[PDB]
C-alpha cells in the first residue's frame, strides 16, 4: 500500500526457537532484561510482533 500495509506482521521476540510445524499467536509482552513488565510496554518490555 502507498502508506504502507501494516496488516501483515511477524514475530521478532521469543524465549526459544520453534519446533517444526509449530504455530504461536501469543501477543503477551516480552521482558528483555531482569525486571518484569506488568503487561505494560516500556524499558526491557516489548510487544513481540
Amino acid at each position, epitope marked *: 500500500k502507498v502508506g504502507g500495509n501494516y496488516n501483515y506482521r511477524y514475530r521478532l521476540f521469543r524465549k526459544s526457537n520453534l519446533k517444526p510445524f509449530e504455530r504461536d499467536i501469543s501477543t*503477551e509482552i516480552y521482558q528483555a532484561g531482569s525486571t518484569p513488565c*506488568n*503487561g505494560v510496554q516500556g524499558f526491557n518490555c516489548y510487544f513481540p510482533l
Partner: antibody
Amino acid sequence: EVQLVESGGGVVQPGGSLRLSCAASGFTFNSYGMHWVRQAPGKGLEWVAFIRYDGGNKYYADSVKGRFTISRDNSKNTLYLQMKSLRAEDTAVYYCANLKDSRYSGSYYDYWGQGTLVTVS
Amino acid sequence: VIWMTQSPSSLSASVGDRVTITCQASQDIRFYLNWYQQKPGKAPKLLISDASNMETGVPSRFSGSGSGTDFTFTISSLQPEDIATYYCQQYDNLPFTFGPGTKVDFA
C-alpha cells in the same frame, strides 16, 4: 493416606557427599514424575531437580547441575538424590514432592513430604 | 532460565481487608503458574494451578488471574488463618522456578 518421607539428612563437611532418599506410599509412585525442592533457613523455595515416571529423563537447576544426581526405584517406591562436592550454600531443608503440572509430569494432585535437613560445616 | 519475581516483598493487613499479591515471570508463560501458601515449619500447600484453577478444598475467598508475564493473587477478605508466605511458581519450561515469596503480616 498419601505419604512422602525423606531421610538421610544430617551434618557433613564441605567437598563431601550425601545420599538422600524419599519413601512413598498411598499413591501410584510409578505413574508420576518426581521433583526435589530445597529451602535454606530464612529463605524461599529453590527447585533442584526432576525425574520422569520411567526414571529416564532428568533435569537440574544450574546451582546443582553437574554436582547432583537424581534417580528412583519404582519397585521400592523410593526417590533418591545423590549430592557430591557439597558446599556451605547447600545447607537447607530438602523436600521430595509431586508438583501439580499440566505440561511435563501430568500430575493432577500436589503432594509434599515433611523435609529433611542437610547441613554443610 | 525463566526468572520469577514478586511484589511487594511483604505487606501488612487486618482481618476483612483485601490482599493483593503480584507475581511476574521473566518471560511469557501463558497461564501456566502455580500459587503456593506456606506457614512456618510446614511444607507449602497449593492453592491455585494454571493461573486461575482453584484447588479442591480451598476457600472461595481466594482467587487469581492473569496471563503471559503478569499474574495476580487475591484474598477478597483476609482471615486470621491466612497469615503466611505466598510463592508463585512457573512450570512452563524446565528448569522450574519459584518466586522470592511474599510475606503477609497481621496488622
